[PDB]
Amino acid sequence: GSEFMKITISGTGYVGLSNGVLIAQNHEVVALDIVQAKVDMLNQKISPIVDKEIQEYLAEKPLNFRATTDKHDAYRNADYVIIATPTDYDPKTNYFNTSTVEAVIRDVTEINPNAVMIIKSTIPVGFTRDIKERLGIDNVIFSPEFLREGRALYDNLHPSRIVIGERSARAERFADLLKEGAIKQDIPTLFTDSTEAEAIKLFANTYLALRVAYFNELDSYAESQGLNSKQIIEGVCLDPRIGNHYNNPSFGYGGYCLPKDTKQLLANYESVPNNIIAAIVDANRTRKDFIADSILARKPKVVGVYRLSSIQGIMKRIKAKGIPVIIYEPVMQEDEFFNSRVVRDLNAFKQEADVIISNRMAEELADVADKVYTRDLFG
Amino acid sequence: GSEFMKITISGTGYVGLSNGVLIAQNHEVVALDIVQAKVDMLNQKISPIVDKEIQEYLAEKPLNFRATTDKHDAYRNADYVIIATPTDYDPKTNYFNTSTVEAVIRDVTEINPNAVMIIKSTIPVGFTRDIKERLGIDNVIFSPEFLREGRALYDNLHPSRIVIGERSARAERFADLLKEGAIKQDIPTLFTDSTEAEAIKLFANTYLALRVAYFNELDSYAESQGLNSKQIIEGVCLDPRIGNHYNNPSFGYGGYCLPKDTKQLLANYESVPNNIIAAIVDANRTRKDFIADSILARKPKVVGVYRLSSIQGIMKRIKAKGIPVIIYEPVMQEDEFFNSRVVRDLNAFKQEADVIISNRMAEELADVADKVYTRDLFG
Numbered sequence: 001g002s003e004f005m006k007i008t009i010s011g012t013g014y015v016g017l018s019n020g021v022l023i024a025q026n027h028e029v030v031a032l033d034i035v036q037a038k039v040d041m042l043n044q045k046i047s048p049i050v051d052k053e054i055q056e057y058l059a060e061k062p063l064n065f066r067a068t069t070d071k072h073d074a075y076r077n078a079d080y081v082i083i084a085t086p087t088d089y090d091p092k093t094n095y096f097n098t099s100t101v102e103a104v105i106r107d108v109t110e111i112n113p114n115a116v117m118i119i120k121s122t123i124p125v126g127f128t129r130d131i132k133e134r135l136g137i138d139n140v141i142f143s144p145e146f147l148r149e150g151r152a153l154y155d156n157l158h159p160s161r162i163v164i165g166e167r168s169a170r171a172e173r174f175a176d177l178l179k180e181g182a183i184k185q186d187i188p189t190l191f192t193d194s195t196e197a198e199a200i201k202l203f204a205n206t207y208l209a210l211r212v213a214y215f216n217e218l219d220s221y222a223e224s225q226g227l228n229s230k231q232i233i234e235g236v237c238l239d240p241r242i243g244n245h246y247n248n249p250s251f252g253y254g255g256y257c258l259p260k261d262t263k264q265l266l267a268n269y270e271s272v273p274n275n276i277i278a279a280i281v282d283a284n285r286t287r288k289d290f291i292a293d294s295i296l297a298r299k300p301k302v303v304g305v306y307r308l309s310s311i312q313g314i315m316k317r318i319k320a321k322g323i324p325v326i327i328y329e330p331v332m333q334e335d336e337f338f339n340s341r342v343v344r345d346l347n348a349f350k351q352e353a354d355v356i357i358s359n360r361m362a363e364e365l366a367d368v369a370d371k372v373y374t375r376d377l378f379g
Numbered sequence: 380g381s382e383f384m385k386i387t388i389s390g391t392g393y394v395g396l397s398n399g400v401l402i403a404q405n406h407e408v409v410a411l412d413i414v415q416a417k418v419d420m421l422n423q424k425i426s427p428i429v430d431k432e433i434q435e436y437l438a439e440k441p442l443n444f445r446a447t448t449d450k451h452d453a454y455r456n457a458d459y460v461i462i463a464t465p466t467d468y469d470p471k472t473n474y475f476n477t478s479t480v481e482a483v484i485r486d487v488t489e490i491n492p493n494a495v496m497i498i499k500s501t502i503p504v505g506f507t508r509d510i511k512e513r514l515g516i517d518n519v520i521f522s523p524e525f526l527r528e529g530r531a532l533y534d535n536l537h538p539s540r541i542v543i544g545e546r547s548a549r550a551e552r553f554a555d556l557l558k559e560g561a562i563k564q565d566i567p568t569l570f571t572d573s574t575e576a577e578a579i580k581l582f583a584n585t586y587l588a589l590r591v592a593y594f595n596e597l598d599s600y601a602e603s604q605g606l607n608s609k610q611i612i613e614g615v616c617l618d619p620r621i622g623n624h625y626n627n628p629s630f631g632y633g634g635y636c637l638p639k640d641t642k643q644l645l646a647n648y649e650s651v652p653n654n655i656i657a658a659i660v661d662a663n664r665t666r667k668d669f670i671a672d673s674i675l676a677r678k679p680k681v682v683g684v685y686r687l688s689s690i691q692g693i694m695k696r697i698k699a700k701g702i703p704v705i706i707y708e709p710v711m712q713e714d715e716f717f718n719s720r721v722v723r724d725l726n727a728f729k730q731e732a733d734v735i736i737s738n739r740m741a742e743e744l745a746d747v748a749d750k751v752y753t754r755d756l757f758g
């Protein structure tokens with residue numbers, strides 16, 4: 001009976017909780033977490049994470065949602081179990097820690113072998129086909145998540161698309177759950193085989209890194225040649241095949257996904273001839289070298305870093321040349337970061353820095369704009 | 380008086396004639412060409428080139444348009460002279476032949492020094508700033524053309540954008556001429572400085588080559604790993620920041636612009652640190668090596684090339700390994716191309732070829748689809 005199902009969420013971070021609150025509008029959702037304090041909060045309709053829509057829906061909407069620390073209570077009778085536990089890929093060792101996902105697969109297989117597991121956690125390419133073969137089970141399907149931390153429920157209410165890594169009626173019924181709870185209508189939906197679904201986010205994020213790296217190389221050329229980067233970029237981006245988005249120069253692509261995913265994809269190309277995949281990684285190092293060299297050519301005695309992630313790579317290079325860096329970051333509470341002073345008073349920071357670097361311009365740097373170096377054009 | 384101006388077109392290829400017919404709907408246009416036969420045809424309202432809309436407008440619309448071989452008749456009293464003469468960049472020697480453009484600048488400067496020249500021909504980055512300085516003149520402005528041969532007047536009637544490489548009222552009046560004749564309304568219009576305008580097409584075409592090269596590397600990986608490329612590409616391209624266009628795998632980017640422009644841009648980066656610009660060129664060689672290797676692994680005794688431009692690079696590599704190639708190309712009338720037989724009978728071609736390669740699938744290859752190798756997914 002697909003009319004009213006039980007869906008268990010294993011993992012209460014933004015991915016699991018966003019999916020759980022979305023589905024609890026129409027089905028029975030039970031959230032499993034190992035931490036009793038998190039379970040008690042959820043049962044009191046308090047979100048353990050910061051996400052405005054998740055907190056609003058938990059507090060104000062009638063959701064058939066509850067939490068528990070009991071695995072048997074959580075998995076028994078579940079039609080689907082969404083696995084959204086933490087995973088991490090380390091590019092230095094090429095190790096992808098999937099232990100939390102494998103622990104859930106172990107527990108569901110033992111407690112309810114008829115449940116269909118949907119992995120939303122990030123996993124390595126080929127993970128699902130391999131784990132099914134290893135354990136001799138069939139009830140595991142991967143589905144990528146395209147959510148932004150802080151707007152995770154909003155992104156599930158208005159998704160770019162839904163992709164489920166199995167071609168079957170049970171995969172389509174899970175996609176239907178995601179569409180039923182959404183506000184956006186006629187959401188693009190794609191069903192693929194397993195390993196293909198697991199490769200989508202690495203190829204999508206690596207294209208975004210390539211696009212930023214390309215506009216950054218155009219910007220390196222414009223600076224080197226004394227040209228106006230904004231004029232060139234706006235003219236280029238008026239071609240509708242290119243578009244006016246994701247084209248703002250910076251000190252390099254950063255954030256929590258692009259640096260690691262581009263490297264993870266390159267490792268997957270160890271036996272595949274390529275030049276672009278490897279260049280996306282190299283390009284970022286070259287761009288940071290160019291930006292650092294431009295700053296160092298101004299012969300500053302102290303460089304001020306306004307806000308703290310590619311700017312970290314710039315700071316590293318400036319310090320390697322023996323020039324002190326001071327940091328302005330109101331969110332940090334320590335007085336030192338990577339051996340550099342964190343200055344609390346903005347006016348003291350502005351006065352001492354000979355060049356203030358910022359990945360993006362800010363209103364509060366307006367009065368010292370003359371000594372601000374930023375390649376931001378569009379805000 | 381901008382109400383009714385005289386605009387001379389120097390060059391009657393698709394760029395000059397498209398611009399001339401567009402502007403002749405509202406102003407006086409005089410086309411100058413060195414070839415008397417071309418002038419006589421134009422005066423009889425016959426187009427010397429193949430372009431449906433150009434021929435329809437010349438024959439059916441009231442255009443204030445005429446042609447002449449007399450430079451004095453053509454340039455005298457002109458408010459603007461559009462320079463659309465042939466130019467060519469040779470990547471092997473890094474030589475950009477701009478002789479025809481410099482000859483027009485010479486003639487207009489002597490005959491009518493008050494005319495404002497608009498260069499639409501492709502020229503090297505920095506050309507206009509340098510020629511103005513060299514000759515001591517101010518009346519030359521570059522404006523990129525974004526036209527497709529065969530639909531050149533259509534692309535001027537519905538342009539992606541208009542970019543004029545000078546910030547001035549006389550530049551804006553020329554943009555107004557282009558907008559007045561167009562069918563599309565509220566056309567995006569950008570005014571830039573000179574060298575910036577000259578760099579736009581190289582950066583736009585190189586992004587398109589990068590995009591094709593990236594989807595081709597994704598395709599190399601999918602083939603190498605036994606995965607369905609279409610599933611991965613459709614999932615990736617459903618991200619609206621990426622889009623479902625210009626994402627069809629092929630044997631490499633080709634055509635008349637991308638191979639040369641990517642190399643021209645790389646030459647311009649001789650003193651600018653980069654990895655992506657150089658990788659776009661290298662990637663195409665690597666992709667052609669991958670495609671050739673995939674074909675050669677099938678141990679064919681004869682490879683059939685269905686239609687003739689990246690497939691040429693594949694043919695070169697197959698022949699380097701000592702395997703004969705036969706070519707099916709109805710448009711060619713010779714029986715040999717680069718030392719390979721051109722076969723006229725499609726059934727004879729199909730029977731003799733052990734593997735038939737085609738950059739895109741075609742209906743007439745449907746009955747031999749089993750031995751057809753193509754990476755086309757979308758048509």
Ligand SMILES: O=c1ccn([C@@H]2O[C@H](COP(=O)(O)O)[C@@H](O)[C@H]2O)c(=O)[nH]1
Binds near residue numbers: 212251309
């Ligand atoms: O136009 C852009 C868009 C993104 N980024 C960088 O790419 C990374 C991913 O951006 P986002 O997708 O998280 O916004 C971030 O480091 C962001 O600053 C840019 O440099 N320019």
Ligand SMILES: O=c1ccn([C@@H]2O[C@H](COP(=O)(O)O)[C@@H](O)[C@H]2O)c(=O)[nH]1
Binds near residue numbers: 627631632
């Ligand atoms: O999705 C695409 C789009 C373009 N191209 C290739 O890129 C070059 C430029 O295409 P166009 O802009 O002339 O259509 C041509 O060789 C074309 O086959 C592809 O391989 N795949």
